[PDB]
Amino acid sequence: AALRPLVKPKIVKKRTKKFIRHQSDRYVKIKRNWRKPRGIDNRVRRRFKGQILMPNIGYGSNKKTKHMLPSGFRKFLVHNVKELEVLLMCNKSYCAEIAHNVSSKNRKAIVERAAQLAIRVTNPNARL
RNA sequence: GCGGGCCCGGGUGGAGCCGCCGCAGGUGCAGAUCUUGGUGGUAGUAGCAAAUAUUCAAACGAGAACUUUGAAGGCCGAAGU
Ligand SMILES: [Mg+2]
Ligand SMILES: [Mg+2]
Ligand SMILES: [Mg+2]
Ligand SMILES: [Mg+2]
């Protein structure tokens, strides 16, 4: 019985797999982070058949559901209760995110204040 | 998040750290027979073959083919090992 968002449309994604760098599987020194190929003779660079896809502007997500969580909210990093009170007038569209560096002593106070103000927390029972 | 990357959960860690508005740079690596350091397959592999040769018993010793003692068989054969 969580706080439902104002609008929960169907989120559609053009692609969900990560874009992996070319030859990142063959070598350990080559990481999964994408790098634009620029070789003169590169199958991926000139889009050969059955090769690794390159990121394009076409894969852009719909602006209505962009940055939207599966619940229907948007993340907002919160470091203290004063920053939590900012989301008072955006509770139905945005949810508070508690920073990892916040100690457990203040995390419970932030969670209690969010419950009082009716703001969803994506990590309410995080550290205890 | 198209992406460069980023935000949380868990574990280790024990003392500093980050966001924003601007400023500045010794600021982003897959190659350069690049420099330094480390680690693999090869691989328990090549190899431990130049100059005739060792054997028996005892002692010390936890442990003896290689140490010592005694016996036997050999070599260097006075421009000699
Ligand atoms: Mg390198
Ligand atoms: Mg060409
Ligand atoms: Mg052998
Ligand atoms: Mg002779």
Side-chain angles (χ1 to χ4, degrees):
Chain A
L3 294 318
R4 308 299 295 273
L6 177 71
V7 180
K8 188 190 298 295
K10 296 297 298 301
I11 299 178
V12 285
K13 301 179 179 298
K14 308 281 186 57
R15 177 181 172 90
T16 50
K17 297 181 181 178
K18 293 274 297 182
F19 285 93
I20 63 176
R21 189 182 174 183
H22 185 26
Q23 285 190 337
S24 59
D25 52 81
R26 302 181 69 95
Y27 298 93
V28 180
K29 63 171 177 291
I30 305 305
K31 300 179 181 60
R32 195 183 61 180
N33 298 87
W34 171 256
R35 291 296 182 268
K36 181 64 175 302
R38 289 180 178 88
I40 57 178
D41 306 326
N42 195 326
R43 307 182 297 181
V44 180
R45 194 263 300 173
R46 48 183 172 174
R47 294 184 286 260
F48 275 4
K49 186 179 182 181
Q51 298 299 326
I52 293 182
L53 304 175
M54 297 187 298
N56 298 320
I57 197 59
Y59 294 96
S61 180
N62 186 18
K63 298 185 296 297
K64 296 293 181 58
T65 60
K66 190 176 180 180
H67 293 281
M68 182 177 299
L69 298 183
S71 61
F73 295 88
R74 276 79 182 276
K75 298 166 61 67
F76 180 76
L77 193 60
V78 168
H79 296 267
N80 50 82
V81 51
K82 193 266 299 178
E83 300 182 3
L84 173 67
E85 295 182 359
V86 182
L87 295 182
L88 179 63
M89 299 300 298
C90 298
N91 54 286
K92 303 185 68 60
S93 297
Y94 300 90
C95 59
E97 184 73 19
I98 303 181
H100 68 287
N101 53 86
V102 180
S103 65
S104 60
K105 186 178 184 300
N106 307 322
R107 180 169 285 97
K108 56 182 303 299
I110 295 180
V111 168
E112 184 177 3
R113 191 75 185 106
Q116 290 189 1
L117 298 180
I119 275 81
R120 279 197 63 174
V121 180
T122 66
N123 47 337
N125 44 13
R127 186 173 301 179
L128 303 179

